[PDB]
Amino acid sequence: MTDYVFKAGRKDLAPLLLLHSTGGDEHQLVEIAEMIAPSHPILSIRGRINEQGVNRYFKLRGLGGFTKENFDLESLDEETDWLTDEVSLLAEKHDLDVHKMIAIGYSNGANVALNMFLRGKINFDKIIAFHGMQLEDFEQTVQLDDKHVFLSYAPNDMIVPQKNFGDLKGDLEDSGCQLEIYESSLGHQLTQEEVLAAKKWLTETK
C-alpha cells in the first residue's frame, strides 16, 4: 500500500513530484516544495526500501566504503520501473499531467529522479536535484535538448565525489539539458540558500 501525500494546490499549475533523502519520508520535502513553487499541486511518494527502518528508493550493497559500487543496480532498475508506473497511476487518480511535472528531490530521491530522466522512464518537464549524483554509467538514448535542470553541489560533500558530479553534469549536457549549478557550503546537508536559489531559478525558467 503506497505511502504518499497529495496536496491539491491550484489545479492549472505544474505538479511537483517530491522524492526524499535516505531516512526521509513522504512528508520531508513538503514545506520546502511549498517555498520553491508556491500554489503548485504536490505529489510526494515514499521509497519502498526500509532495511533497518531507513527509508530509501533502492538497495545498497553494503559496501559503505564505496560510492557507485554500493548501489544495487538491479534494485535501482526494479524500483524505478515501479516508481514510474506509480507516478502514472497517481497522476491518473489526481488528474495531474506527467509531462508538466517538476521533480524536486534531495540526495537519494534526487538521484532516482535524475536516473529515471536520463533512462527516459519519465518525461519530467524540469528537475530540481539537491545534492544529487550519478548512480551508474550507461548509454543514454534520451534526447533532452529543451529541458531545464537545477543541481546543487558542495565541494565539502563527502558523499558526492567531484568526478562523480562532473559525470552527472556531463550526462545531462550530452543529452542536451540546460543546467543551472548552485554551489552550497554545508557538505551533503540541504541549505536554506540552495532552496531560495531553486525558487529563484524556477521563477526564471517556469
PDB file of C-alpha atoms in Angstrom:
ATOM      1  CA  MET A   1       0.000   0.000   0.000  1.00  0.00           C
ATOM      2  CA  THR A   2       1.795   3.049  -1.350  1.00  0.00           C
ATOM      3  CA  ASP A   3       2.793   5.631   1.199  1.00  0.00           C
ATOM      4  CA  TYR A   4       2.242   9.049  -0.413  1.00  0.00           C
ATOM      5  CA  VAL A   5       0.974  12.629   0.150  1.00  0.00           C
ATOM      6  CA  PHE A   6      -1.127  14.551  -2.361  1.00  0.00           C
ATOM      7  CA  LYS A   7      -1.887  18.261  -1.784  1.00  0.00           C
ATOM      8  CA  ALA A   8      -4.135  19.746  -4.438  1.00  0.00           C
ATOM      9  CA  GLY A   9      -2.789  23.344  -4.759  1.00  0.00           C
ATOM     10  CA  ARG A  10      -4.048  25.245  -7.806  1.00  0.00           C
ATOM     11  CA  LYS A  11      -5.115  22.661 -10.386  1.00  0.00           C
ATOM     12  CA  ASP A  12      -3.835  24.520 -13.517  1.00  0.00           C
ATOM     13  CA  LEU A  13      -0.242  24.802 -12.227  1.00  0.00           C
ATOM     14  CA  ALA A  14       2.501  22.236 -12.947  1.00  0.00           C
ATOM     15  CA  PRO A  15       2.614  19.375 -10.463  1.00  0.00           C
ATOM     16  CA  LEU A  16       5.625  18.739  -8.228  1.00  0.00           C
ATOM     17  CA  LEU A  17       6.891  15.190  -7.580  1.00  0.00           C
ATOM     18  CA  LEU A  18       8.845  15.102  -4.293  1.00  0.00           C
ATOM     19  CA  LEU A  19      11.447  12.470  -3.546  1.00  0.00           C
ATOM     20  CA  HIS A  20      13.044  12.237  -0.085  1.00  0.00           C
ATOM     21  CA  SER A  21      16.624  11.557   1.074  1.00  0.00           C
ATOM     22  CA  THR A  22      17.794   8.409   2.844  1.00  0.00           C
ATOM     23  CA  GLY A  23      15.872   8.117   6.067  1.00  0.00           C
ATOM     24  CA  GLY A  24      13.293  10.667   4.896  1.00  0.00           C
ATOM     25  CA  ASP A  25       9.644  10.068   4.163  1.00  0.00           C
ATOM     26  CA  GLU A  26       6.754  11.410   2.065  1.00  0.00           C
ATOM     27  CA  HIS A  27       6.424  14.488   4.354  1.00  0.00           C
ATOM     28  CA  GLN A  28      10.099  15.503   4.392  1.00  0.00           C
ATOM     29  CA  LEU A  29      10.067  17.922   1.421  1.00  0.00           C
ATOM     30  CA  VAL A  30       6.531  19.265   1.602  1.00  0.00           C
ATOM     31  CA  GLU A  31       7.267  22.674   3.201  1.00  0.00           C
ATOM     32  CA  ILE A  32      10.391  23.023   1.082  1.00  0.00           C
ATOM     33  CA  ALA A  33       8.375  22.450  -2.148  1.00  0.00           C
ATOM     34  CA  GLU A  34       5.803  24.962  -0.903  1.00  0.00           C
ATOM     35  CA  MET A  35       8.622  27.588  -0.715  1.00  0.00           C
ATOM     36  CA  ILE A  36      10.093  26.680  -4.112  1.00  0.00           C
ATOM     37  CA  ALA A  37       6.838  26.531  -6.096  1.00  0.00           C
ATOM     38  CA  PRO A  38       4.041  28.237  -4.124  1.00  0.00           C
ATOM     39  CA  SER A  39       0.494  27.037  -5.005  1.00  0.00           C
ATOM     40  CA  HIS A  40       1.641  24.091  -7.194  1.00  0.00           C
ATOM     41  CA  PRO A  41      -0.053  20.715  -6.605  1.00  0.00           C
ATOM     42  CA  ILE A  42       2.237  18.314  -4.734  1.00  0.00           C
ATOM     43  CA  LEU A  43       2.676  14.583  -5.163  1.00  0.00           C
ATOM     44  CA  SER A  44       5.178  13.006  -2.725  1.00  0.00           C
ATOM     45  CA  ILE A  45       5.876   9.256  -2.817  1.00  0.00           C
ATOM     46  CA  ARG A  46       7.848   7.256  -0.176  1.00  0.00           C
ATOM     47  CA  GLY A  47      10.578   4.851  -1.301  1.00  0.00           C
ATOM     48  CA  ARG A  48       9.704   1.163  -0.871  1.00  0.00           C
ATOM     49  CA  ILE A  49      13.075   0.130   0.696  1.00  0.00           C
ATOM     50  CA  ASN A  50      13.237   0.032   4.518  1.00  0.00           C
ATOM     51  CA  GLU A  51      16.317  -2.053   5.513  1.00  0.00           C
ATOM     52  CA  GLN A  52      16.734  -1.491   9.260  1.00  0.00           C
ATOM     53  CA  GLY A  53      13.928   1.104   9.292  1.00  0.00           C
ATOM     54  CA  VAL A  54      15.817   3.570   6.994  1.00  0.00           C
ATOM     55  CA  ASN A  55      13.532   4.672   4.101  1.00  0.00           C
ATOM     56  CA  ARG A  56      15.250   4.569   0.655  1.00  0.00           C
ATOM     57  CA  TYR A  57      14.334   4.240  -3.038  1.00  0.00           C
ATOM     58  CA  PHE A  58      16.688   1.333  -3.848  1.00  0.00           C
ATOM     59  CA  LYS A  59      19.038  -1.068  -2.068  1.00  0.00           C
ATOM     60  CA  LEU A  60      22.706  -0.640  -1.181  1.00  0.00           C
ATOM     61  CA  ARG A  61      25.245  -3.484  -1.339  1.00  0.00           C
ATOM     62  CA  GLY A  62      26.657  -2.763   1.955  1.00  0.00           C
ATOM     63  CA  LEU A  63      29.958  -1.642   0.747  1.00  0.00           C
ATOM     64  CA  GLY A  64      29.591   1.684   2.663  1.00  0.00           C
ATOM     65  CA  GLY A  65      33.264   2.453   1.925  1.00  0.00           C
ATOM     66  CA  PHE A  66      32.321   2.816  -1.782  1.00  0.00           C
ATOM     67  CA  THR A  67      30.233   5.147  -3.946  1.00  0.00           C
ATOM     68  CA  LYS A  68      28.913   3.552  -7.220  1.00  0.00           C
ATOM     69  CA  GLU A  69      29.948   0.016  -6.184  1.00  0.00           C
ATOM     70  CA  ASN A  70      27.480   0.251  -3.269  1.00  0.00           C
ATOM     71  CA  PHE A  71      24.425   0.913  -5.486  1.00  0.00           C
ATOM     72  CA  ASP A  72      22.367  -2.199  -6.278  1.00  0.00           C
ATOM     73  CA  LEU A  73      21.600  -1.596  -9.955  1.00  0.00           C
ATOM     74  CA  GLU A  74      19.110  -4.461 -10.201  1.00  0.00           C
ATOM     75  CA  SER A  75      17.164  -2.884  -7.325  1.00  0.00           C
ATOM     76  CA  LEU A  76      17.557   0.560  -8.897  1.00  0.00           C
ATOM     77  CA  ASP A  77      16.101  -0.793 -12.123  1.00  0.00           C
ATOM     78  CA  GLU A  78      13.192  -2.620 -10.414  1.00  0.00           C
ATOM     79  CA  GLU A  79      12.232   0.311  -8.137  1.00  0.00           C
ATOM     80  CA  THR A  80      12.423   2.881 -10.912  1.00  0.00           C
ATOM     81  CA  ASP A  81      10.034   0.720 -13.030  1.00  0.00           C
ATOM     82  CA  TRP A  82       7.764   0.629 -10.005  1.00  0.00           C
ATOM     83  CA  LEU A  83       8.048   4.362  -9.354  1.00  0.00           C
ATOM     84  CA  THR A  84       7.407   5.387 -12.982  1.00  0.00           C
ATOM     85  CA  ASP A  85       4.254   3.199 -13.008  1.00  0.00           C
ATOM     86  CA  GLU A  86       3.219   4.573  -9.622  1.00  0.00           C
ATOM     87  CA  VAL A  87       3.658   8.169 -10.800  1.00  0.00           C
ATOM     88  CA  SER A  88       1.479   7.464 -13.859  1.00  0.00           C
ATOM     89  CA  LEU A  89      -1.173   5.763 -11.689  1.00  0.00           C
ATOM     90  CA  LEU A  90      -1.358   8.546  -9.107  1.00  0.00           C
ATOM     91  CA  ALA A  91      -1.289  11.237 -11.809  1.00  0.00           C
ATOM     92  CA  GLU A  92      -4.298   9.409 -13.222  1.00  0.00           C
ATOM     93  CA  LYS A  93      -6.047   9.324  -9.812  1.00  0.00           C
ATOM     94  CA  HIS A  94      -5.342  13.005  -9.093  1.00  0.00           C
ATOM     95  CA  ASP A  95      -5.674  14.440 -12.644  1.00  0.00           C
ATOM     96  CA  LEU A  96      -2.061  15.531 -12.931  1.00  0.00           C
ATOM     97  CA  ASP A  97      -0.106  15.847 -16.193  1.00  0.00           C
ATOM     98  CA  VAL A  98       3.201  13.954 -16.012  1.00  0.00           C
ATOM     99  CA  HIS A  99       4.658  15.928 -18.959  1.00  0.00           C
ATOM    100  CA  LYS A 100       4.298  19.128 -16.845  1.00  0.00           C
ATOM    101  CA  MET A 101       5.830  17.539 -13.749  1.00  0.00           C
ATOM    102  CA  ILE A 102       8.694  19.206 -11.876  1.00  0.00           C
ATOM    103  CA  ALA A 103      10.712  16.688  -9.850  1.00  0.00           C
ATOM    104  CA  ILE A 104      12.179  18.021  -6.628  1.00  0.00           C
ATOM    105  CA  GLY A 105      14.478  15.560  -4.882  1.00  0.00           C
ATOM    106  CA  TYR A 106      17.088  15.594  -2.179  1.00  0.00           C
ATOM    107  CA  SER A 107      20.036  13.117  -2.127  1.00  0.00           C
ATOM    108  CA  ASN A 108      18.622   9.550  -2.610  1.00  0.00           C
ATOM    109  CA  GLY A 109      15.341  10.907  -4.149  1.00  0.00           C
ATOM    110  CA  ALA A 110      17.244  13.379  -6.387  1.00  0.00           C
ATOM    111  CA  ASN A 111      19.451  10.509  -7.656  1.00  0.00           C
ATOM    112  CA  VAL A 112      16.452   8.392  -8.540  1.00  0.00           C
ATOM    113  CA  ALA A 113      14.699  11.297 -10.361  1.00  0.00           C
ATOM    114  CA  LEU A 114      17.870  12.042 -12.313  1.00  0.00           C
ATOM    115  CA  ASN A 115      18.339   8.402 -13.221  1.00  0.00           C
ATOM    116  CA  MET A 116      14.693   7.987 -14.403  1.00  0.00           C
ATOM    117  CA  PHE A 117      15.047  11.159 -16.519  1.00  0.00           C
ATOM    118  CA  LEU A 118      18.317  10.014 -18.103  1.00  0.00           C
ATOM    119  CA  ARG A 119      16.972   6.493 -18.708  1.00  0.00           C
ATOM    120  CA  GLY A 120      13.830   8.010 -20.329  1.00  0.00           C
ATOM    121  CA  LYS A 121      11.454   6.284 -17.895  1.00  0.00           C
ATOM    122  CA  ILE A 122       9.647   9.562 -17.016  1.00  0.00           C
ATOM    123  CA  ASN A 123       9.318  12.677 -19.213  1.00  0.00           C
ATOM    124  CA  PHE A 124       9.586  15.316 -16.444  1.00  0.00           C
ATOM    125  CA  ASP A 125       9.361  18.916 -17.626  1.00  0.00           C
ATOM    126  CA  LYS A 126      12.086  20.064 -15.161  1.00  0.00           C
ATOM    127  CA  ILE A 127      14.211  18.656 -12.321  1.00  0.00           C
ATOM    128  CA  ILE A 128      15.491  20.336  -9.175  1.00  0.00           C
ATOM    129  CA  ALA A 129      18.075  17.953  -7.658  1.00  0.00           C
ATOM    130  CA  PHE A 130      19.630  18.876  -4.301  1.00  0.00           C
ATOM    131  CA  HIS A 131      22.942  17.113  -3.707  1.00  0.00           C
ATOM    132  CA  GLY A 132      22.446  14.572  -6.462  1.00  0.00           C
ATOM    133  CA  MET A 133      24.987  12.320  -8.144  1.00  0.00           C
ATOM    134  CA  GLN A 134      25.479   9.806 -10.932  1.00  0.00           C
ATOM    135  CA  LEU A 135      24.288   6.282  -9.879  1.00  0.00           C
ATOM    136  CA  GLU A 136      25.508   4.372 -12.971  1.00  0.00           C
ATOM    137  CA  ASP A 137      27.297   4.889 -16.294  1.00  0.00           C
ATOM    138  CA  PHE A 138      25.294   3.746 -19.364  1.00  0.00           C
ATOM    139  CA  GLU A 139      24.366   4.608 -22.980  1.00  0.00           C
ATOM    140  CA  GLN A 140      21.682   7.324 -22.782  1.00  0.00           C
ATOM    141  CA  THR A 141      19.350   7.145 -25.784  1.00  0.00           C
ATOM    142  CA  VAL A 142      17.414  10.141 -24.485  1.00  0.00           C
ATOM    143  CA  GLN A 143      17.346  13.482 -26.136  1.00  0.00           C
ATOM    144  CA  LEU A 144      16.582  16.178 -23.593  1.00  0.00           C
ATOM    145  CA  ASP A 145      17.609  19.200 -25.673  1.00  0.00           C
ATOM    146  CA  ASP A 146      14.829  21.557 -24.475  1.00  0.00           C
ATOM    147  CA  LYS A 147      14.928  20.648 -20.752  1.00  0.00           C
ATOM    148  CA  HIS A 148      15.987  22.790 -17.792  1.00  0.00           C
ATOM    149  CA  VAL A 149      17.525  21.214 -14.714  1.00  0.00           C
ATOM    150  CA  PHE A 150      18.782  22.741 -11.407  1.00  0.00           C
ATOM    151  CA  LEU A 151      21.573  20.942  -9.477  1.00  0.00           C
ATOM    152  CA  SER A 152      23.285  21.770  -6.221  1.00  0.00           C
ATOM    153  CA  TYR A 153      26.718  20.544  -5.175  1.00  0.00           C
ATOM    154  CA  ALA A 154      29.025  21.243  -2.213  1.00  0.00           C
ATOM    155  CA  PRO A 155      32.801  20.717  -2.584  1.00  0.00           C
ATOM    156  CA  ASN A 156      32.931  19.510   1.046  1.00  0.00           C
ATOM    157  CA  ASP A 157      30.279  16.845   0.408  1.00  0.00           C
ATOM    158  CA  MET A 158      31.967  13.581   1.445  1.00  0.00           C
ATOM    159  CA  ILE A 159      29.142  11.657  -0.234  1.00  0.00           C
ATOM    160  CA  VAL A 160      29.376  13.084  -3.743  1.00  0.00           C
ATOM    161  CA  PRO A 161      32.857  12.944  -5.335  1.00  0.00           C
ATOM    162  CA  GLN A 162      33.783  15.816  -7.643  1.00  0.00           C
ATOM    163  CA  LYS A 163      34.430  13.418 -10.543  1.00  0.00           C
ATOM    164  CA  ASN A 164      31.062  11.822  -9.966  1.00  0.00           C
ATOM    165  CA  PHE A 165      29.249  15.183 -10.052  1.00  0.00           C
ATOM    166  CA  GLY A 166      31.212  16.027 -13.288  1.00  0.00           C
ATOM    167  CA  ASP A 167      29.872  12.822 -14.843  1.00  0.00           C
ATOM    168  CA  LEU A 168      26.301  13.649 -13.839  1.00  0.00           C
ATOM    169  CA  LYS A 169      26.544  17.161 -15.365  1.00  0.00           C
ATOM    170  CA  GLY A 170      28.224  15.667 -18.460  1.00  0.00           C
ATOM    171  CA  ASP A 171      25.487  13.042 -18.947  1.00  0.00           C
ATOM    172  CA  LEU A 172      22.809  15.757 -18.717  1.00  0.00           C
ATOM    173  CA  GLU A 173      24.651  18.184 -21.034  1.00  0.00           C
ATOM    174  CA  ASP A 174      25.412  15.404 -23.511  1.00  0.00           C
ATOM    175  CA  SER A 175      21.631  14.792 -23.624  1.00  0.00           C
ATOM    176  CA  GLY A 176      21.116  18.478 -24.356  1.00  0.00           C
ATOM    177  CA  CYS A 177      19.940  19.813 -20.951  1.00  0.00           C
ATOM    178  CA  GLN A 178      20.328  23.437 -19.927  1.00  0.00           C
ATOM    179  CA  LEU A 179      21.811  23.300 -16.412  1.00  0.00           C
ATOM    180  CA  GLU A 180      21.925  25.670 -13.513  1.00  0.00           C
ATOM    181  CA  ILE A 181      24.518  24.692 -10.911  1.00  0.00           C
ATOM    182  CA  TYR A 182      24.278  26.033  -7.347  1.00  0.00           C
ATOM    183  CA  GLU A 183      27.319  25.648  -5.046  1.00  0.00           C
ATOM    184  CA  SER A 184      26.468  25.267  -1.292  1.00  0.00           C
ATOM    185  CA  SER A 185      28.939  25.148   1.640  1.00  0.00           C
ATOM    186  CA  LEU A 186      27.492  22.617   4.075  1.00  0.00           C
ATOM    187  CA  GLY A 187      28.566  19.291   2.570  1.00  0.00           C
ATOM    188  CA  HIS A 188      25.638  16.892   1.908  1.00  0.00           C
ATOM    189  CA  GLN A 189      23.260  18.981   4.043  1.00  0.00           C
ATOM    190  CA  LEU A 190      20.338  20.746   2.328  1.00  0.00           C
ATOM    191  CA  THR A 191      20.719  24.520   2.910  1.00  0.00           C
ATOM    192  CA  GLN A 192      18.212  27.368   3.103  1.00  0.00           C
ATOM    193  CA  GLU A 193      20.273  29.208   0.485  1.00  0.00           C
ATOM    194  CA  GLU A 194      20.132  26.441  -2.108  1.00  0.00           C
ATOM    195  CA  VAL A 195      16.353  26.241  -1.702  1.00  0.00           C
ATOM    196  CA  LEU A 196      15.995  30.009  -2.320  1.00  0.00           C
ATOM    197  CA  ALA A 197      18.309  29.638  -5.346  1.00  0.00           C
ATOM    198  CA  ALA A 198      15.956  26.943  -6.737  1.00  0.00           C
ATOM    199  CA  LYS A 199      12.907  29.160  -6.019  1.00  0.00           C
ATOM    200  CA  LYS A 200      14.553  31.979  -7.963  1.00  0.00           C
ATOM    201  CA  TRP A 201      15.595  29.659 -10.790  1.00  0.00           C
ATOM    202  CA  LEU A 202      12.042  28.321 -11.109  1.00  0.00           C
ATOM    203  CA  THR A 203      10.656  31.917 -11.495  1.00  0.00           C
ATOM    204  CA  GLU A 204      13.144  32.376 -14.366  1.00  0.00           C
ATOM    205  CA  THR A 205      12.515  29.063 -16.123  1.00  0.00           C
ATOM    206  CA  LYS A 206       8.896  28.237 -15.168  1.00  0.00           C
TER     207      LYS A 206
END
